[PDB]
């Protein structure tokens, strides 16, 4: 045929030439579509499945099965043509052109009688060649699809099947839905083990077996927008193409996990000995940012080291924490310290201010409006911020200020790592670090006191799903002395930018401590009375220009500045 | 692709027509990393308008002709593809599909074509709609097999509205983030683009101007993006030099920027230090009387701007207490016109209508599903 | 004019005359009376308006007994929906009102939905011929557009 | 000008002159008057603007008595829709304002819809000539598009 060559690609001739990828696995569904093609009436399989699962590949695996004789006798010597509906609409301008090109195609399929037709994107069959008075491609094929005198394979996304095929109910019973499911990991492994020749030849790399096990395992676990076959092939291709630029070569699993680390932003890569040394000395690097508060700095370090050892539950988040304690002692500052440790940015912290969830009607800010409602397509602050960054530190600041029905949205967040938004897209929280910070006698003879206040306020199944409940110490006076050392170093950092020093005395650091420590708050006031009583009186002396580069400013409001 | 809907950027880089692409080399390497893949070798340059997404591809097309490509991209004639011109002329059935299949047939025969589709969000529903023969569904089979190499260029909003929303198109394309350059990166761009704009305008452009173009466009222009906004200052100042004539300087950039925003060149070409040195006398011009208030806020802004400032505090927080209308919002307008040069920077929220916490969901936005969302 | 609102008087009435005359020219290998008009209208709207068979008349008078083959007890409501159907088949129902409007109220499980299914199987032979609008899925006002449709210029208008 | 909103002055009025002279020349097979123009406007818009015949003048005199053949009691309401129709046929209503504007209110079942149907049965001989816009299915914000139509380009505009 030559009519089918200009409106279609012969996949049987492409499988003779070895131009189709080998379809290793998926034999149970090639067998399934050969049953539908062998039918008397309605011999038309539509391959419905998610994007990536290999719907087009099964038909390419059928075309490889025809050229090898692995088909039944009623499918032998069939020429399978990927019918390009766009090529049929192309070259039409006039009334009756597209209908004439279809009748010429269907005349050749009737004449030869050895054509399996493959309409990839079968949802584009409705409204194909539709115009001022034009019989569409669907209405012309429907008499032949219903009587079995045209053997057409379709392939449609499950989304595009419910949106376009099921909206034409006379066309959905022209086709048999063959479920093309996403493969399991061990099936995806066997796909990669069979596709290893095409990717070792394209990238001139050597893809090892553990790389393909890791490409299928780490893709199901850490990629949640694409589908098994692709997501894992994507890790193989991007690793072989990254090694193509390195030689401008063996692809191990560390080359796969590095590609996944560059792409999801989830640190999953094989541990650098300098990075392991960073994780082992995590606490004292978190103690650079926050002073004291050891039973939390030791406890969020155990959660991150449990993640990077590969010892966390893959069905739960990386860490779940109540930072309970008094105000001002570094509940948010540790969450920012943990975000700087994992990203180098305070703005990588997803801070959800739970104070403005005070009623029970603002929970759609977390997960989006349900369908029908305003902000259904722009819906979910918490869901969209983690759909984009799966590895995150999510802060729920002042968790007791929220209504107690906002926690019930976050229960299966803690237990399952799931938060299905209002659109219905489940967002993976399995790699987040969830932090719930909470500001919330007599004759005898704080951790017992605070944990009972949580049991009174929070639900018993909310606290049951928190990994670590951490009560915070009120900072002692000597811990305030170590904090004024830390908070002048911001001022002293931008003063050494001008080459001038700022050295305080013991009386100056004690006076900041007496003006910064409160039984009400604590440290928070200390941050204020340094940027109001040290930083302001240095800024106007830069304005006065009585200081300069090559000077030291000793300090002993009532503070002295030389 | 013919030279009918696109433009050979590889042949443009042979004749030295593409502007030099300074920086953005992590992105050109990332685009090569996508284009060297076997299947779905289709990068999307995701950025903002004017961050240099076309410049990454111009830098790639230069890297093809200089042999800096990894023997998968060697001698690839990179063509653009104006899908806007490709849709244009479709008033009849099959016009768009015919002009796209001619392009797609031309790539099939030559086999060395890399499409650059600027505005790849236009691909969805370019012919009719999502479930219809559009440009997306025509290209989706060959994009999924690596047989059509296509560099896209959307913004971050348009990638999320059109490519992520379209199932079976998010997989075909690989996101390559092109961020907005920093100011120091933009000065390196302008110094690399220095010989192009000096030779075009026949006007010498100094290092003082290019630092001024990148710094002041990041400050004073906030609807556009660094690389472009700052190049447009260099380009317009060299153009307005031609209508005055030999040298573009710091003050020449502040003039052509002052004609855009409306700031007087002085408020652009100043120096925070001096800029706030005679602050008191300029705030007396619309506040006469209550002089201790002006000298208090002039002292406070000069403390909380000049010298030391943490980036974790606003420029100043003030409670204006006292009798109403004696210069309360009259000083704040007088402070706003001093702020960077525009009186139109004062915003009255008018909290008197609020006596409700439920109306705080009608001031900071509503939860979605409720009134007060727009 | 009574049993059609999709068509217009002259034609619809000519439709009944022409098709009953065409049914009788099939039977003669001959007179078209009002019973043959009502057979044609019953074949076409699906509304039983034709003259009652003595077997069907016995079935309507023995309706309470034949609904009690599926509904144990509840004789107050079995006779209430039987009075509604007999009022329709006697042609004594208000032509402007529906054949019967009922609120089956009471306790859970005692056969409110089952009588509606028994009434639908009595009238049609299938209890899946019951148009069952389950009102629990109407939770706020805006789901009323499931009943009558979307207004013009909104999705699902067609 | 008064009784058309779809045509334009020159012809709209030549339409009345020409068709009245055409209706008059069918009668002589010779004077077209004020009343002959309003008969043509009555045939064409459907609005009774023509001079009342003696059978119809007394019918509007006894209209409250003719509405009481179909509604029992409600005398204050039958009079007030009688004051409105008789303003219109006396050429005497404000022509910047509908011929009658009424809130029928009160208890359920006392003849609010029945009077509206009786008023439409008076003026037209049939109560299905009532444009009955049942507003209970318009409780959505945007079902106003059923009353006036979709804007152009949005489905169901035509």
């Amino acid at each position: 045929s030559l009519v089918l060559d200009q409106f279609g690609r012969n996949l049987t001739a492409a499988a003779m030439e070895g131009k189709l990828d080998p379809v290793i696995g998926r034999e149970k569904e090639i067998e399934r579509v050969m049953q539908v093609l062998s039918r008397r009436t309605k011999n038309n399989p539509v391959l419905i499945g998610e994007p990536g699962v290999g719907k087009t590949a099964v038909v390419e695996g059928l075309a490889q099965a025809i050229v090898h004789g692995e088909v039944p006798e009623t499918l032998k010597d069939k020429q399978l043509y990927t019918l390009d509906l766009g090529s049929l609409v192309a070259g039409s301008r006039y009334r009756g052109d597209f209908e004439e090109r279809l009748k010429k195609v269907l005349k050749e399929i009737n004449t030869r009688g050895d054509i399996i037709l493959f309409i990839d994107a079968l949802h584009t069959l409705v409204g194909a060649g539709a115009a001022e008075g034009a019989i569409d491609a669907a209405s012309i094929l429907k008499p032949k699809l219903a009587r079995g005198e045209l053997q057409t394979i379709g392939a449609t996304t499950l989304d595009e099947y419910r949106k376009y095929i099921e909206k034409d109910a006379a066309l959905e019973r022209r086709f048999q839905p063959v479920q093309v499911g996403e493969p399991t990991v061990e099936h995806t492994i066997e796909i990669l083990k069979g596709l290893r020749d095409r990717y070792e030849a394209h990238h001139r790399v050597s893809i090892t077996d553990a790389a393909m096990v890791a490409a299928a395992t780490l893709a199901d676990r850490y990629i949640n927008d694409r589908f098994l076959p692709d997501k894992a092939i994507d890790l193989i291709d991007e690793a072989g193409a990254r090694m193509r630029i390195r030689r401008m070569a063996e692809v191990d699993d560390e080359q796969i996990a590095e590609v996944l680390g560059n792409w999801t932003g989830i640190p999953v890569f094989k541990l650098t000995e300098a990075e392991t040394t960073r994780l082992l000395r995590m606490e004292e690097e978190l103690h650079k940012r926050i002073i004291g508060q050891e039973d939390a700095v030791k406890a969020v370090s155990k959660a991150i080291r449990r993640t990077r050892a590969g010892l966390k539950d893959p069905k739960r988040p990386s860490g779940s924490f109540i930072f309970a304690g008094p105000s001002g002692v570094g509940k948010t500052e540790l969450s920012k310290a943990l975000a700087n440790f994992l990203f180098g940015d305070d703005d990588a912290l997803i801070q959800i201010d739970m104070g403005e969830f005070h009623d029970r009607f603002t929970a759609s800010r977390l997960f989006g409006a349900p369908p029908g409602y305003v902000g259904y397509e722009e819906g979910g602050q918490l869901t969209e911020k983690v759909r984009r960054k799966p590895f995150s530190v999510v802060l729920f600041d002042a968790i007791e200020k929220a209504h107690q029905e906002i926690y019930n949205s976050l229960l299966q967040v803690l237990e399952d790592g799931r938060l299905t938004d209002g659109q219905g897209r489940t967002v993976d929280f399995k790699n987040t670090v969830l932090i719930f910070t909470s500001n919330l006698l007599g004759f005898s003879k704080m951790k017992q006191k605070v944990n009972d206040e949580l049991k009174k306020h929070f639900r018993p199944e909310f606290l049951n799903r928190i990994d670590d409940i951490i009560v915070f110490h009120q900072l002692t006076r000597e811990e305030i002395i170590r904090m004024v050392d830390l908070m002048i170093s911001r001022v002293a950092g931008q003063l050494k930018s001008k080459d001038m020093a700022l050295v305080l005395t013991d009386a100056a650091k004690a006076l900041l401590a007496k003006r910064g420590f409160d039984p009400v708050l604590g440290a928070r006031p200390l941050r204020r009375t340094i940027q109001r009583e040290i930083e302001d009186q240095l800024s106007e002396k830069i304005l006065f220009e009585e200081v300069g580069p090559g000077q030291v400013v000793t300090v002993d409001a009532v503070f002295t500045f030389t | 692709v013919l030279d009918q809907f696109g433009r050979n950027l590889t042949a443009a880089a042979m004749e030295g027509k593409l502007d030099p692409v300074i920086g953005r080399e992590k992105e050109i390497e990332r685009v090569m990393q996508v284009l060297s893949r076997r299947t779905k070798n289709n990068p999307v340059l995701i950025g903002e308008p004017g961050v240099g997404k076309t410049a990454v591809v111009e830098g790639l097309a230069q890297a093809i002709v200089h042999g800096e490509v990894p023997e998968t991209l060697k001698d690839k004639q990179l063509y653009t593809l104006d899908l806007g011109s490709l849709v244009a002329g479709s008033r009849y059935r099959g016009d768009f599909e015919e002009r796209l299949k001619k392009v797609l047939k031309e790539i099939n025969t030559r086999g060395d074509i890399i499409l650059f589709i600027d505005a790849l969000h236009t691909l969805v529903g370019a012919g009719a709609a999502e479930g219809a023969i559009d440009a997306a569904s025509i290209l989706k089979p060959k994009l999924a097999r690596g047989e059509l190499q296509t560099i896209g260029a959307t913004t971050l909003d348009e990638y999320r509205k059109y490519i992520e929303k379209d199932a079976a198109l998010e997989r075909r394309f690989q996101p390559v983030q092109v961020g907005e350059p920093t100011v120091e990166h933009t000065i390196e761009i302008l110094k690399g683009l220095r010989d192009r704009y000096e030779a075009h305008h026949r006007v010498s452009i100094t290092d003082a101007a290019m630092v001024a173009a990148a710094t002041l466009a990041d400050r004073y222009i906030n609807d556009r993006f660094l690389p472009d906004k700052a190049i447009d200052l260099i380009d317009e100042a060299g153009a307005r030099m031609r209508i005055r004539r030999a040298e573009v300087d710091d003050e020449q950039i502040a003039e052509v920027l002052g004609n855009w925003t409306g700031i007087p060149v002085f408020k652009l070409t100043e120096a925070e230090t001096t800029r706030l040195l005679r602050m008191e006398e300029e705030l007396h011009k619309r506040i006469i009387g209550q002089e201790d208030a002006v000298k208090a806020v002039s002292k406070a802004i000069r403390r909380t701007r000049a010298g030391l400032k943490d980036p974790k505090r606003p420029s100043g927080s003030f409670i204006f207490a006292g009798p109403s209308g004696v210069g309360k919002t009259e000083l704040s307008k007088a402070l706003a016109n001093f702020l960077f040069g525009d009186d139109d920077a004062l915003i009255q929220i008018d909290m008197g209508e609020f006596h409700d916490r439920f109306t705080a969901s009608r001031l900071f936005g509503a939860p979605p599903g409720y009134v007060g969302y727009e | 004019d009574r049993y059609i609102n999709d068509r217009f008087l002259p034609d619809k009435a000519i439709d009944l005359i022409d098709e009953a005359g065409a049914r009788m020219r099939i039977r003669r290998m001959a007179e078209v009376d009002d019973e043959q008009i009502a057979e044609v209208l019953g074949n076409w709207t699906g509304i039983p308006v034709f003259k009652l068979t003595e077997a069907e008349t016995t079935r309507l008078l023995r309706m309470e007994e034949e609904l009690h083959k599926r509904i144990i007890g509840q004789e107050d409501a079995v006779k209430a929906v039987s009075k509604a159907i007999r009022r329709t088949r006697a042609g004594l129902k208000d032509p402007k009102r529906p054949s019967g409007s009922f609120i089956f109220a009471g306790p859970s499980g005692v056969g409110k939905t089952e009588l509606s299914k028994a009434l639908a199987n009595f009238l049609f032979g299938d209890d899946d011929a019951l148009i069952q609008i389950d009102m629990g899925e109407f939770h706020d006002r805006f789901t009323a557009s499931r009943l009558f449709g979307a207004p013009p210029g909104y999705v699902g208008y067609e | 000008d008064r009784y058309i909103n779809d045509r334009f002055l020159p012809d709209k009025a030549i339409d009345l002159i020409d068709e009245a002279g055409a209706r008059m020349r069918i009668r002589r097979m010779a004077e077209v008057d004020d009343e002959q123009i309003a008969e043509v406007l009555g045939n064409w818009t459907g609005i009774p603007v023509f001079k009342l015949t003696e059978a119809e003048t007394t019918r509007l005199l006894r209209m409250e008595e003719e509405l009481h053949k179909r509604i029992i009691g409600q005398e204050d309401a039958v009079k007030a829709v009688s004051k409105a129709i008789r303003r219109t046929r006396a050429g005497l209503k404000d022509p910047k304002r509908p011929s009658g504007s009424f809130i029928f209110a009160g208890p359920s079942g006392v003849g609010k819809t029945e009077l509206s149907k009786a008023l439409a049965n008076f003026l037209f001989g049939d109560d299905d000539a009532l444009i009955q816009i049942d507003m209970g299915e318009f409780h959505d914000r945007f079902t106003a598009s059923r009353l006036f139509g979709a804007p152009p380009g949005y489905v169901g505009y035509e």
Partner: peptide, 24 residues
């Protein structure tokens, strides 16, 4: 309190096929 955002469906159709006038 809630608002439903409706969804004004637009009328969108493919371009019209035309019928040609012949000039010999």
């Amino acid at each position: 309190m809630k608002v439903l955002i409706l969804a004004c469906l637009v009328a969108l159709a493919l371009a019209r096929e035309l019928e040609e006038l012949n000039v010999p």
